[PDB]
Amino acid sequence: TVALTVPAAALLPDGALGESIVRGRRYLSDTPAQLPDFVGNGLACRHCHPGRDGEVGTEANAAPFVGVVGRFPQYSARHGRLITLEQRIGDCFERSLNGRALALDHPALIDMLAYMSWLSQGVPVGAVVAGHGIPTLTLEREPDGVHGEALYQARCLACHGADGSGTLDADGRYLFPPLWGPRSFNTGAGMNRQATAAGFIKHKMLSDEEAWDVAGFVLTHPRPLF
Ligand code: HEC
Ligand code: HEC
Numbered sequence: 001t002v003a004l005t006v007p008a009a010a011l012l013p014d015g016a017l018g019e020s021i022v023r024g025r026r027y028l029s030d031t032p033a034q035l036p037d038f039v040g041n042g043l044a045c046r047h048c049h050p051g052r053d054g055e056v057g058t059e060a061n062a063a064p065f066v067g068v069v070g071r072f073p074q075y076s077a078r079h080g081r082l083i084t085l086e087q088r089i090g091d092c093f094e095r096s097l098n099g100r101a102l103a104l105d106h107p108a109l110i111d112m113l114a115y116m117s118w119l120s121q122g123v124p125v126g127a128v129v130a131g132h133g134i135p136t137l138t139l140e141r142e143p144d145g146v147h148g149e150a151l152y153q154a155r156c157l158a159c160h161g162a163d164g165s166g167t168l169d170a171d172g173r174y175l176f177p178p179l180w181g182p183r184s185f186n187t188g189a190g191m192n193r194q195a196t197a198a199g200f201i202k203h204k205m206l207s208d209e210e211a212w213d214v215a216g217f218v219l220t221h222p223r224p225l226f
Contacts, residue, residue, distance in 0.1 A: 001130040004066050006051075006058045007121045017114060024115025027108050028056040030173065031097065035108060040098035041224070042166065042174050042183035048096065048134075048191060048200070057119060060131025061203040065116040067129030085113060095188035098224050136195035137202045139209065143194060143216025151214040155206070164221060180221035188226025194219060 012018045027034050031044040049065065051058035057065030072085035079087070086109055090101025102109040123129060159176040160166055166178040178184040190196050198215035202208065 002067070002123060002127045004058075004060055004064060004129050004131045005122070006055060006066065007118060009053075009055075012118070020111045020114040021118045023108070024111035024113070024118075025054070025056060027112050028115060029054070033173065035102070038093050038097070038099045038102055040100070041185065042178050043097050043185060044173070044177075045092070045097075047174065047177040050204070055119070057116070059204075061133075061135055062200065063134050064119075064129065064131060066119045067123040067127065067132060069113070069117050069120045070123055070125040070127060071132075085116070089113075092189075095226055096185045096191065098186045098226075134190075134196055134200050135203065137198040137208060137211055138195045139198075139212045143198075143219075144213045145217045145220050147210075148213040148215070148217025148220075151206075151210050152217050155210075156214065164218070179218050180223050182224060184223045186224040186226040192219065192223070 012021060028045040028049070031046075032039040032042060046056045049057040049059075049063050051064075057063065057068075069085060072088065073082045075081065076083045076088070076091075078091070083091075084104075086104045087101075089109060089112060090104075093099045093101050156179075160179050161176075163181065164179040165181055165183065166174045167176040169175040185191050191200065194212075194215055197219060198212045201215050201218075202211035205211075206214070
């Protein structure tokens with residue numbers, strides 16, 4: 001692999017590319033408000049692809065975008081063929097954001113691509129960045145939703161709510177995003193898979209057993225059908 005580094009915002013170029021990158025950051029950070037026609041729930045991309053210092057997609061094991069551009073096109077089993085990064089983004093609009101894919105030449109999509117390309121600056125095409133994706137966590141027993149409920153009350157509820165509906169900020173963006181219900185990701189999202197949710201929770205915060213069980217509890221709840 002190659003190491004994950006984040007480029008310096010102060011070194012963004014003047015001109016069309018720089019402006020595009022800045023818009024791309026905003027689309028990824030503030031998606032429901034910036035792209036209402038395409039977002040069907042309360043989630044922004046940053047809610048599963050966090051970053052520090054206002055950036056999005058810069059954290060190891062939380063599916064960083066650093067280095068993503070050089071890994072596409074790639075095979076997708078759901079499509080049964082190679083897909084582009086633009087298509088992958090559309091899939092997450094449809095699934096994680098319970099919405100509608102942007103046209104493949106939509107200016108907002110291109111800005112998001114520009115931003116991801118900026119994050120990927122210096123990464124060799126084809127190279128894998130350390131910390132890419134969300135590593136799965138799989139245990140050799142069923143997740144215990146009863147244990148998970150107790151864990152949720154003790155470790156998660158204060159932020160994500162008794163009803164999993166999250167906490168809004170003063171500007172109507174989710175400070176703490178919804179984990180289930182009509183404003184959360186739909187059943188088509190990767191986060192709806194036990195081992196992915198467990199892995200995400202494990203790394204973004206728990207023991208392996210606790211992460212496994214609390215993920216199980218979270219995933220017992222209704223959410224929109226894809
Ligand atoms: C107790 C173990 C839990 C569980 C099961 C989850 N969380 Fe959180 N969470 C918080 C914030 C600000 C985010 C957005 C991403 C970030 O900036 O770090 C999240 C994100 C999640 C997700 C993915 C998004 C979604 O809506 O599904 C999941 C599955 C998730 N969390 C589960 C904030 C908090 C907290 C405030 C300090 C606490 C405590 C937790 N989360 C605890 C948990
Ligand atoms: C949680 C419900 C998510 C939201 C909201 C978004 N994404 Fe996502 N994304 C998520 C997971 C669990 C994964 C799989 C990680 C892995 O192990 O590969 C992804 C993956 C992507 C990718 C591919 C990353 C890679 O191949 O390394 C891209 C390009 C991506 N996601 C983009 C993206 C955008 C633009 C979003 C807002 C529209 C978005 N995602 C929201 C979980 C979630």
